[PDB]
Write a protein that binds this DNA or RNA. Sequence first.
DNA 1: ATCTGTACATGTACAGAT
DNA 2: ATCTGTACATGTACAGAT
DNA 3: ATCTGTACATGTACAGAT
DNA 4: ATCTGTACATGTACAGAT
Lengths: 343, 346
Amino acid sequence: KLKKVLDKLRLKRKDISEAAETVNKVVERLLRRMQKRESEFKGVEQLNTGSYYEHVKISAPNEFDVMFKLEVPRIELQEYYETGAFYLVKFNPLSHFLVLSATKMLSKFRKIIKEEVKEIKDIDVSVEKEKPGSPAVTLLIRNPEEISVDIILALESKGSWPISTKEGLPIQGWLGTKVRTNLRREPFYLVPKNAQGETWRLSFSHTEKYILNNHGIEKTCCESSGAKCCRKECLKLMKYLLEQLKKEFQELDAFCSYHVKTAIFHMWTQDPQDSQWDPRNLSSCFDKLLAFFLECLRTEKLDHYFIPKFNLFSQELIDRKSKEFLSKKIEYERNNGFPIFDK
Amino acid sequence: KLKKVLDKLRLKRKDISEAAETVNKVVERLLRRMQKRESEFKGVEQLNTGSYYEHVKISAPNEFDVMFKLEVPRIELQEYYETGAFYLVKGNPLSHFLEGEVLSATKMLSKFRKIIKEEVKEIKDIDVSVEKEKPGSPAVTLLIRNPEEISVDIILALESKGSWPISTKEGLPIQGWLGTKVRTNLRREPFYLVPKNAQGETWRLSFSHTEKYILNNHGIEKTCCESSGAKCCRKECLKLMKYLLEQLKKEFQELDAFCSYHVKTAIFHMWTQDPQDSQWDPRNLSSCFDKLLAFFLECLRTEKLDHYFIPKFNLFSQELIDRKSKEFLSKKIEYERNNGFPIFDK
DNA sequence: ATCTGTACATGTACAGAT
DNA sequence: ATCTGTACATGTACAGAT
DNA sequence: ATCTGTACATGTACAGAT
DNA sequence: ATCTGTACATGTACAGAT
Ligand SMILES: Nc1ncnc2c1ncn2[C@@H]1O[C@H](COP(=O)(O)O[C@@H]2[C@H](O)[C@@H](COP(=O)(O)OP(=O)(O)OP(=O)(O)O)O[C@H]2n2cnc3c(=O)[nH]cnc32)[C@@H](O)[C@H]1O
Ligand SMILES: Nc1ncnc2c1ncn2[C@@H]1O[C@H](COP(=O)(O)OP(=O)(O)OP(=O)(O)O)[C@@H](O)[C@H]1O
Ligand SMILES: [Mg+2]
Ligand SMILES: [Mg+2]
Ligand SMILES: [Zn+2]
Ligand SMILES: [Zn+2]
């Protein structure tokens, strides 16, 4: 039933092989260009993020997310009002992006990438028209197949995480206090998503990657000498429900995969035991996930998992209309055996 | 009953405070000295090991173990006659300890020892001498007196960052317990060679750093023994077993061949055999301790206790310990077991 | 003026003390 | 149930060296 | 400072056993 | 239908060499 759906959603090794071989060619070349040429981004380092690298990518290997992270000296943050997620950066190579302007820096980053792509004749690859606000430089590759790659500029700070995250990452009952303390000793990242043009947003893609690949209360969850859980499978099913709904109804344009990822982090925290995510109980697990996501919509509350004061479902970010709309559509699919899965 | 014993065994904060304040003074000074002038041990780094740093030290804070580890690039090992544990190592600073390519353990240890003795002489803050050398030991042992007697084993160590030696490939069977990711990461840590004998150029592998990790990350659940997790009795069983041996050892010299490492090894095997945190419930301390004794007794009777990291190395081989010694310890354990542990009452 | 090995600053888990 | 000392990991400041 | 080699985890694909 | 074993593929951390 849902096994049958996950089978459809499963990526093929051949497709993975071909898609990766190309994406890596391009990314390696873009990365080479940032240092081996005397740009402001010399020393920038690669960090693969998102669904493909978490092993929760569904349908096809056609969307890849990569951080080009840049370690910066002693940095001063100032929270953009009380948003929790957005900051101004303050205090050498970067002088010419001065307060460090996100858009000015992103523009140069973008300009370089556009130049390097022009010089690529191996592969059919253009640079997508800029979406204002967005921190990505998006590449549209065509093998025969359409593949998109988000190159995300990132500042890496080695200081302790900003105050807004102090109560974030409530993994203590699930992954534990040692894991949490160690995770919060990793750097934090700022990406140039706006709000305006000088605002950066916190990024925990590196932390989310760790969590995805170390998601059990037991150290052996999903390992060769351990028991398989269905945590990732539920994430996939939920992602697919949204993807399918999103491509049918334009009313759902305000919703994205990060909403679902956030909700399931909360579910995993609420239901820490690996036994509460037994493969045999895939149906009820998926169901309790839907129920939870519906409560978030109804209460208009979905807190950033790392930044509790940042509500992704705040009125200011998404209309009541949009939420009620998605509620009805989810409720419908739920109470009619998920017809949309059959497409 | 056993809670009451563990209460006695528990260290006091006051004693910990005083003992540590002194030990650290001495060790910091000894370590500072190694970095001086054209010392062959410049770059040597500190790594605290053993029971005190694993939180399984019992009775008093009176024995501390410290590795002074020294990174040695481009190093070639040759296993000493298929033993698994022992190896030969082959204007550089260590040049002075070589015998045509071969790094002498004893020559190196001797210099190490000489330096330490010299540095201790110059300490008048604290009452601290250097214990007479124990044959078949890699340690330089300090006897500090505070008022109270405290000993500190300074252990010379080579640090190699290469892959662990072949003999350990089947070692550390933690896959069903701590997992494959933990194991892979652990085996990416360096391995250590200490100058224990067999001859004067032989070194022995050391996994004290790994054992420390295991002790402090001993559960199948990541929250085992944490503030938002469930307490197990794994460490408590180790303490009780250590105490049984310590008490027996200081009464009967027949038990001189036995050490705390034997019990530590046995319990690593027990933890592997019983991976679930529920199999080590605090409420079931008695049966947990009992199954541990039963296991240790089987090891003695079958004369088999494999090094947890080096499976082919049997710590209870006839060549290391007499049948007599094992049977003796068997009877004494069996006795304590079947008479309510009278020796705990001392 | 810049660079650096060393010491310190900051944070938390663990366990003992209250 | 809360509070506190020690160990340990990671970041950063800086007197002495260059 | 950069690059390659090695080991193994997380996947997929599929046959034979249950 | 599911489970187990093997083969094949990609990702990633880190050591040793340059
Ligand atoms: N903080 C960030 N760290 C890393 N990458 C980021 C971050 N913020 C944004 N990005 C990347 O920028 C591109 C566009 O982002 P938008 O902010 O315009 O909207 C995001 C996007 O449309 C959607 C899905 O993101 P992603 O492709 O990473 O999803 P996935 O988890 O890989 O799954 P699938 O590819 O299978 O769907 O989510 C939106 N979004 C909103 N907030 C966030 C956030 O904090 N992190 C990530 N996405 C977010 C994208 O490439 C995005 O990754
Ligand atoms: N025979 C041995 N083989 C391998 N490692 C050993 C051996 N003996 C001791 N060690 C290592 O040296 C460490 C310190 O030795 P020591 O005898 O002090 O034991 P311990 O675990 O500290 O317990 P305690 O000191 O309370 O008896 C041990 O924890 C272990 O890692
Ligand atoms: Mg993605
Ligand atoms: Mg000790
Ligand atoms: Zn799992
Ligand atoms: Zn425990």
